[PDB]
Each structure stands twice: as structure tokens, then as C-alpha cells.
């Protein structure tokens, strides 16, 4: 019931920010489906309290849908 072992892994690779993966995965963003609705303030909840990091995710959203 789980053939992936990644989810948003390769997703963060498109922008080179997978380092924050575990940061959002251990908060409740492991689901790329839900992360697709993540807000700007939600990123800081996973440890993404950076400007270049906050603007990256938003761009990575529309990128890989």
C-alpha cells in the first residue's frame, strides 16, 4: 500500500531544496497533494523561515503542479 518511498523527494530536487524535505515531512507536508495548497506562513512551520526558501516552494508548486 505504498509504492513510492519518496513523495515530494524528487519534487524538491527540481529546485534543489530537498534538504527541507524532512522539515516539512515531519510536520505534515509529506503529501505532495496537500503541500500543493501550503501557504507562505506554513513553510516557516516546517523550518522554512527564509525568503529565498519561501519563494522557492511557491515556484516549485506551479512547476510540478
Domain count, the chain: 1
What whole-number distance in Å separates Cα of residue 43 and Cα of residue 47?
7
Cell of 57: 516552494
Domain around 26: 1-65
Helical segments of 1-65, H only? 9-13, 21-25, 32-35, 40-45, 51-63
Q: Give the count of beta carbons closer than 10 Å to the beta carbon of residue 7.
A: 17
Buried b (16+ CB within 10 A) or exposed e, 21-50: bebbbeeebbebeebeebeeebbeebebee
Cell of 23: 522539515
CB-based contacts of 5, cutoff 8 Å, min separation 6: none
What whole-number distance in Å separates Cα of residue 15 and Cα of residue 2?
25
Q: Give the count of beta carbons closer than 10 Å to the beta carbon of residue 8.
A: 22
Experimental method: NMR
What whole-number distance in Å separates Cα of residue 39 and Cα of residue 44?
9
CATH number of domain containing 33 = 1.10.150.50
Cell of 7: 513523495
Cell of 56: 522557492
Amino acid at each position: 500500500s505504498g509504492l513510492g518511498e519518496a513523495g515530494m523527494s524528487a519534487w524538491l530536487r527540481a529546485i534543489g531544496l530537498e534538504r527541507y524535505e524532512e522539515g516539512l515531512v515531519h510536520n505534515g507536508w509529506d503529501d505532495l497533494e496537500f503541500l500543493s495548497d501550503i501557504t507562505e506562513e506554513d513553510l516557516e512551520e516546517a523550518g522554512v523561515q527564509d525568503p529565498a526558501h519561501k519563494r522557492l516552494l511557491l515556484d516549485t508548486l506551479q512547476l510540478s503542479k
